[PDB]
Each structure stands twice: as structure tokens, then as C-alpha cells.
Amino acid sequence: STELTVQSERAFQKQPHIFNNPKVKTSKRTKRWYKNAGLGFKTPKTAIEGSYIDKKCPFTGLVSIRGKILTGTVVSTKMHRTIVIRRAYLHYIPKYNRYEKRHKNVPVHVSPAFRVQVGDIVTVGQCRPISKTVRFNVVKVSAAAGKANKQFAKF
Amino acid sequence: MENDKGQLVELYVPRKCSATNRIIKADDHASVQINVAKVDEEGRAIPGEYVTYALSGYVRSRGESDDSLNRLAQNDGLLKNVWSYSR
Amino acid sequence: GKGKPRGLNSARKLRVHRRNNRWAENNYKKRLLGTAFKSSPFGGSSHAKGIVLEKLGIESKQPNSAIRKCVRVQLIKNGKKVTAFVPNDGCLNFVDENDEVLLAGFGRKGKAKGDIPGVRFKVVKVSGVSLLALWKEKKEKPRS
Amino acid sequence: VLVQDLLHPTAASEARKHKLKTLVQGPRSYFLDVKCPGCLNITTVFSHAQTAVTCESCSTILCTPTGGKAKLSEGTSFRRK
């Protein structure tokens, strides 16, 4: 999320150990740092362009993505800098030789590099424990808006 | 119904209703077999020479015994225009 | 198809219906309600040892006409009182109220046996010496 | 029955069936060119109008709707094409 005035906390936000010497008159005004997550996941330009300060970002922060990579559809965007996705799957009962619809919701951190809204399929990647429940991080958006621009007024 | 070294086993290859090509079993005492004579030059039905058709009991019960014969005897020769392939 | 959803993703509906309809199964019902533990003088066990209160002349049901010799027993582990049969002509001379008999099921899954009304148990031992043995001559009943 | 041609049905027993039960379904209505000699020009009318068709120039009449085929009005010619 984080929207407008990154310096909005009691503690000054900053990237760790990314020093900017004031004696040397610079034009970028803040030496910024970013990494490439890996597995061919494009580190989106908004992470390099933007000036957010999220330390749980997989592109600008101090987490790493390793292990399971999962996808799922977004079902709530009501938490700040974190969402919840619904991953669906059919589960097999042998005795009847048929299936049943099951599902699990996965809480997943989302860097302000991405702008998400409910309905979007998203690719997440497992990282270290981020919070009490978050064990995945949003890493690539597969939808755009779920045909939102094609829902305008009369012709 | 052969066996390992070709020898014909399992007696009694049954008949077959020429209208349905289904089997005419033993106890099918409702079936039939119709012998048609072989007429020659100027009358003279040849005795002992037949054009035989066999019909199941199921066909004759359903009434199709008549209509099915017209079709079977016509294209086998002994009918001039009576039967119709269209309706 | 008459009822049962034949769909390939209808397993939940098919499981739950089974679950539900098992309850009409008399045995499945008892097994999950733990009836043997709740009801059923025996705690769910094969036998149960108890103590003789009084010797009863239970009169057989129709069309039979007899006096079936039985004993009212107060089970040790339970205190539950139970009237139980003493089979084998004689054998009511062996019991002698206040004694310690070993009851057993009658072999009808509850369900009192025969012309004997409301007797779901039979005696197998008294004073720890095997009713059968006393009947023949093999053992003798202990001191007191 | 029990053996017949379902591919080449006779033109009569076919013609008598319902418009949907023919071998390949098709309409049984038609169009027609109607004209009263008061005018020079013709007007193509549908056989089951539902709309009382009026002609080109004058506020005249041509036909009234019914349950089915339109009742063509007073003396007028027609042809099925």
C-alpha cells in the first residue's frame, strides 16, 4: 500500500546501510538499492522507480524467496501492505472415485511495487516467516484488472 | 468356435433370422423358415430346389413378418415393384 | 438416475449422505453412541462378576409352562442389579444367596433368550469353581 | 417400418410433417408481391404479416393479421417469389 508520504512513521524509514553523503551534492537525492529476486521473475520498474521503504519487499527489501512458488486469486485487499489469496483445488475421495471442491486462504505480503485489487490472479513466493501468518510474498501479477476498463457508461 | 490346434469344437452353429441377423435359438418355436419354389421355363416349379428365408419369432410377433419378406424376396429376385424403400 | 448425484465432483455430497444414512444402521448407531458403556449392565465387556441377592422362580413365557431358576445379581464394578439364569437341571442348589457368581451374556446380542422374560445373562461360575464342573462332579464348591 | 430410408423420405410424408420434424428444418411461409390496380408499383409482403401492411404512397390497406397467414385485403393479385 503505503500511498503518499513514505516518511509517515515515528521512526525515520531508510534502507539499511545505504548511505548518502550530504557533502557530495547529488541529483538522485537518495542512493537506492534493489535486487533481482530470481527464477526469471521480473523485478518490476515501480520497485526501482518508486521511493517506498518496505523492508519485506522481495525486490528492495531484506527477504529472500525460496522453496514453494504458488499462484492464487486475490480475495481480500483490506490489510495494509498485505493481502489474502484463495487457492482452490479438487480433492479426491477414492471410495467414490470422484472429487470435491476444497480451498485454503494464504495470507501473503505484497510490496507497494504492485498495485493489486480483488479478483487478480497473483504469483506468490515462499519466504521466511514475515508475520504470525504470512509465509509467502507477492512476486508477479498475472491478471490486470479483470476487464475493468470494459465496464464504462453508455455508448 | 475353434480350439488350440484349429479343431472345430462346441457343436451346433445355430441358424439366423435373415430379417434381423439375430440367432434363432432352439426353443424359439415361434420362428419360421419359408421355402420358395424355383420355377423354370413356362411354369414347372422345380421340386427339391428352394430359395429359403428364415424369420425369428420376434419378427413375426411384431407383425413385420410380411413386410420383411417383401424386402427380402424382392432384391433376391421374386418381386416386381411391390416393396418400397421409401415412405 | 434416481437420486444419487452421478457427477464427477459430487463426492462431498456422496460422502455426507452415507455418513447421514449410516445412522439408520442399528449397529453403527450403538457403536458411536457408546451404548455398551452408557447402557448395558456389563461395562461393554464379555463377562461381569457380581453377587447374589435372592433366588427367583421366573415363570416361563407362553406357550411354555415352567419355573426357570434365576438369581438377582449386583455387579461388582457397577452396583447395577441384574436377574440372571442358572441353567442345567439342578444348579440352583449351588448358588446360595450372598455368593459371588460370574455372569455372562446369553448369546442374543442383548435380547433375553427364550421363554425366560427379561433375562439377558446366565451364570458361568459360582465361588470361582465353574458351574459346569459342579454339575458333573469334577470340582467341589469351596469352604464358604 | 423395421427397414426404410431415413435419408430419402418421400416428398409427401415429408411435406405433411411439422416444420421442425422435417429431415432438415425450414420455413413453410413465403413472400408475395401484392398490388391493387389503383397503383403501378408492387409491395413485397410476408405471408404472416402481424402488421397490417400499407402501401407506398397512399394511406391504403393491403391485409389484416390473423392467427396465421395474413388475410389479404380486397381484390389484389399475388405471386410466390
Add this chain to the structure above:
Amino acid sequence: GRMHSAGKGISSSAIPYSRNAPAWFKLSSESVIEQIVKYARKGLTPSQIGVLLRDAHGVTQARVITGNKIMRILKSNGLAPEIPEDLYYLIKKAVSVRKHLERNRKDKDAKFRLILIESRIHRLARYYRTVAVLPPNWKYESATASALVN
């Protein structure tokens, strides 16, 4: 069939096998497209236009002479109504039924048929809402429907 009754009538158009011309039919796609927009300008429903062109004209069906459906012709030519006409006539009837019911609270039968009409209304709307032709919040409201049609 008959989603809201028990009748089983089979009664449809037998569309001709000939997908191209009548071939005794004259004037061009220009001729009838112009003729469609003409009636659409009067305000006729795409159905009325199709019937008025079937009888008084030689337009057996407008999809043949012109490669476009009548509703799509009005759309392109900026005559597309706010809501589809079936959902219009459903809402239209629902209002009329309701206007009758508010005047006769003793008419159990009309209260019934209202439910049947409205249930089709809500189901149709859900379809149109799924295919983006209605904003993804559109809802039929009794207190606002009579404003929507008349």
C-alpha cells in the same frame, strides 16, 4: 423447458438453410441498413424493426442481406439503448404488475406472478452483469424500476 411454468410447447422459427441471398431480393446492404437506422430513429425496438422489415419490406432476416444483427447495427450507429430490451420488457411488466398489486392487495395471484417475473429479471440481469453489458453493481429495485422505464 418453459423456465417458469409447466408448459412444453415447441414453437420456434424454422430458419432457412440458405444463409446467403434470397437471390430474387434486390437492393443492397446499404438499402436496408439505412432502413434499420430509420426506424431505430423513430425509437422502434430492434424486434419491431425486424418485423416491420419482414412484412412491409423484403428483409427475410437482416443477418443475411447485411452481415450484422439488428441490435449490433443500432449499437454501431449510436442507437444502443441503456439496457437490453428483454430486460426492459421484463422490468416494464414487473412495474405494471406491481402497480396492479398496490391497488389490489387482495390479489394473491398477482403477488405470485410478480415473484416469477422478478426472478427472471434478477437472473437475466446476472447474465448481462457477467458479460460486462451492465456495470458490476447493477440491481433491479422496485422503488426505482418505474423510474427506469417510464
Add this chain to the structure above:
Amino acid sequence: TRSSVLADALNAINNAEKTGKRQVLIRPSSKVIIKFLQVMQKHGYIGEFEYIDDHRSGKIVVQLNGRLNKCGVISPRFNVKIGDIEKWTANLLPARQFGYVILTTSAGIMDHEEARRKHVSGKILGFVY
């Protein structure tokens, strides 16, 4: 509403032979029906069929002889792992020698014995004998 277009095709054919007929009109002629009809005539349980072309889903006319006992469809197109095809043929085929269960694999719609040759599997469609 019509659910398995294949089911209707096969039941019409079974009700045909049972009634002693030699032909049937079937509706409405999906691809899989043809691909099913074609497997039957490969092993001679029907003669030739003709696709008649309305400008709709289509119609078919099948000419059947007398060899067909019962051609059936399996309502849920169950999955069959290659170690279960024998379990299917065993349940619903009159013997080991003859009869075919026809299933649907990635390598095409094909009777079980062919599907054993190419060594591929998938969902089960129906059976012919």
C-alpha cells in the same frame, strides 16, 4: 436439459437393434459421437453412417446390422490409470476374448485394446458389444 449428447446417440442405437430395426436417426451429432460411431464400425458392430448437415448441431443416420448386443456410455467420464483398464473391461464386458471398452486418451479416442498397444490412458467413454 440435454446433458450427454453421446448418451442419447448410444441409447437410440440400442433401442434400434432391440426393436429389430436396421437404421436410426440420431441427434445432435457431436464430434465425439462420430469418433464413437467410428470405433464401432471399425470392429463391425454397425455398418456405414451418414452425417446429414442441417445448419445446426447436425443429424446422423446409422445403418446397423445385427451383431450389436449393447453399446453403452459411462456417465461420469472417470479417470483410468493404466493399471485400472483391466478393472474396467472386467466389470462390464461379457468375456475376455471379445467386446471393447472405448475410452478417451490424449492419443485419441480408442478402444481399450488399441489403448493398450500405444500405451496411453485417460478418461473412460463407454463400451461396445
Add this chain to the structure above:
RNA sequence: AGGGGAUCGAAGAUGAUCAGAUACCGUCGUAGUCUUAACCAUAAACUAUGCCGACUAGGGAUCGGGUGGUGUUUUUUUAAUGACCCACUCGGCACCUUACGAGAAAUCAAAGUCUUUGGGUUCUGGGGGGAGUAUGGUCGCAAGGCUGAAACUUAAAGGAAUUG
């Protein structure tokens, strides 16, 4: 809760019958029956038979719509009409005969196209009593509705048909 209260009439009172006769039959007649405003939500609410779709068999009636006519009748001057007749075709309520088929049978064009067992889907039942009882929940002004056990008991209960 108003109004209405002719009629018939739970209740009650009677006359008779009966060993008795709180009944059947007769008399009187309260509530009710009718209506408005609100409740109640049950009937052998029945076809004791779910819905959507496919296929499978002959027959003549009738209902509604439609198509066909050098058909009949209404005459005016020939029509137009209207009613009627004949053939067809959809969709009705049914009936008749068959049974390939099904069923334990009675019977059933579905209750058929099932051990050659799979079109989609909903609901209920699992020996008889106990018992639609106890308990809790919930709805109702009430009466009661819906949801709804167990212990114990029991070898039968039951269905259709056959002979008596």
C-alpha cells in the same frame, strides 16, 4: 377485533330406541357457517407415483392454435363470412388394444429402454413396537407447527395374489 348472523348446525337440553344408549333417528339450539383486518400452516393437501432431457407401439374420440378445399349448409346475385365435414400438424385432459418390455403380484407406454446394472439433479426409507413419545431448540395469542431421540421390548409385522 368489527360487521353479519337466512341456512345448516361441534356444544348443551330434550323425545324416543336400548339391559344400558352419554350415540345412531326426531326436536330445540350456543359457537360456527358469511365478510373485513390480522393470525394459524395442517388434510387419504392423492395420481398414495419428483423435476428437466432422450428413445421405444397400435387405435379411434375430444380440447386449443394453425395449414390444406373446382368439401356440405346459411342465398342476395355469385361471393365474404359464420357453423359444420374431411386430411394433416403442434400442444392439452383423458380413454381403448397390445406387449416387445417391467413387476412379488395387483398392474404399468411408464412403474419400459437395469446383473448386457451410469443422461442431469432434488428428496426420503433401512424389521416390528416403543413413538412422532421424551428432551432441547424455534414459530404461534392459543390450539398447536417444524426440528426430533433413547432405554426397554419383540420373531415377526407387512405386501400382492390363491384356495377355502
Add this chain to the structure above:
RNA sequence: GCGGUAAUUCCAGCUCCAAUAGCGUAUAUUAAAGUUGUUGCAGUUAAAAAGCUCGUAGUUGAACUUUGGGCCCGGUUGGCCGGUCGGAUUUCCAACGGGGCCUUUCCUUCUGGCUAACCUUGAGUCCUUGUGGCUCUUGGCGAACCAGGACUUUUACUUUGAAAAAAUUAGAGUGUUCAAAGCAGGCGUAUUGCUCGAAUAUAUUAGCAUGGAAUAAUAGAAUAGGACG
């Protein structure tokens, strides 16, 4: 169901049956049970279709979008032959599979590394009247995957494979005297060792890896805010 005075059921004698170092009983559970029915039940009247209709969740859901034809490579059974001192491969033949092509035909995609295969051919030719045959460099095949950049509609199913404890199970070898077992053992110069073993299979949901592209979903270009350069 027997027993109320000739008891084929009780109490015994006699004789007889069944299983037998074992046999009965009680309780539980499994089979019989298609009386829990996915396979596979029943519901007119035997137990069972809600009084009726709407209807959300659930389950389900019409048809149609590269088919058809042509060429090539090399596999595994089976035949008619056996060349050879039980088994062998060529040529002749079918039969059933796999790979790759050209038919308007993404194979994600460019930038080199590499080339295995020929439109190649540079000479001819072991040799059956020669396209039977391969060693063989100087113009001319991409995909066979490396690695670096740039991107990718989603799934279900099925194939194969990796990853995988032992005991248990199924199962091989082996004469614990047999067998349940065990994992031994078997050969000699049995006076200074020889030597076979201690297999194989199942390991099913999920996850990983790979081939397939039927069946069944999903997404796309309609106020063009489209597609390539």
C-alpha cells in the same frame, strides 16, 4: 420349537456323528450384506417423493475452431526359411507400435557456442549388368541444449521417471531331517581354500520431473483503449 405317561429335543445307558491335543461358551468385529448400494439398493400399494411454486449455496449443463492426403528414418514380436557346431542375423512377407517431414501450418524469442544430420560432392568405388555401401574435406539444415538478454493466459486429466527405511505383504534362490521359520549356504586337495548369495515387486493422495494435447474448464478484438514493424 420340545416336555401335560409309548419324549426322534429333557435326565441317563447303549450306539452313532463332527472336529481332534485340542473342543465349547461369552463379547466384539469381518465375510455372508446388492440389509448403507461409487461399483450396487429401495421409495404406486411392503419402510420411503416435502401441499405447492420461487430460489441462493451445491451438483450439472447443446453443437462448432487442423482435419485429410504424401514422403522418409529406425525399432518388437510372428512367420517361410538356417548360415551354424539348443540359438544367430540378412534378405521376402505381413501385423502392431515410435520419431521426423511437405501439404497457407510458432517451434516463445533474438545474440554465438556445436554442429547430428544432407539439398551437399570431392575423387571414385569394395563389388552381383548399381543409388545395395561408408570411411571421406572447400559454398550449403538448426533447435539436439548449452548461457546471456528479452517474455510468457490459466487449469483438470493421463504417460513415464526421479525422490524415496527396515520388519510386514506379494515374491525369487536355498532340502531349517519336514514345516512355521532362517538368511543362509554350496563346493574341495575336508593337511594351512574354492565359491553363489543376502534378489524383484507394491510403495496409490500430495509435492517434484517428463511425454502427450482427446475429454472438461479458463482467458482474448466490440464505444477497438486491438494486432504485427
Add this chain to the structure above:
RNA sequence: GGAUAGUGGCCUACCAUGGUUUCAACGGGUAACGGGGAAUAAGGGUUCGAUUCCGGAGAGGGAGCCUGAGAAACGGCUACCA
């Protein structure tokens, strides 16, 4: 930020209002340690596994802690309850 060997509402402060659910959350029951496995032999299943191996938990019931690489140890200590 503190605390931990370290991640983490693990704890604190500040701020926000979120998190789960008929695809059954939450609650109740279990005469419930989980698994390799066991019994029953057409198949599909049904029932069982305290118990020879693996994993977990405990040491009368709770809590606390010393030593130490490793214990919240009990044939270690301290306290309360029995």
C-alpha cells in the same frame, strides 16, 4: 524496539481494523497418541492399530529452575496441591 541461538504478535509501544466460515468456521464428543501396519480373502469395501520399528508426549498433579553442548530433566533441585 525488546527478548531469543535465531524467524515471528514471541513480548512491548504506537497506529490501523482486520483474521475464519455452508467448500462447515467456531463449539461439543472421542470408551483419540500419529504413522509403518492388523483382521476380513471376486472386486469396490468394512473394521482395528495401548503394544517388538519411526515420530511425539509424560514421569502423582501443576509451575519454576540449577548444571550443561544438549533438560524446562524428575532414579536433579525449589515451591504449592494431593
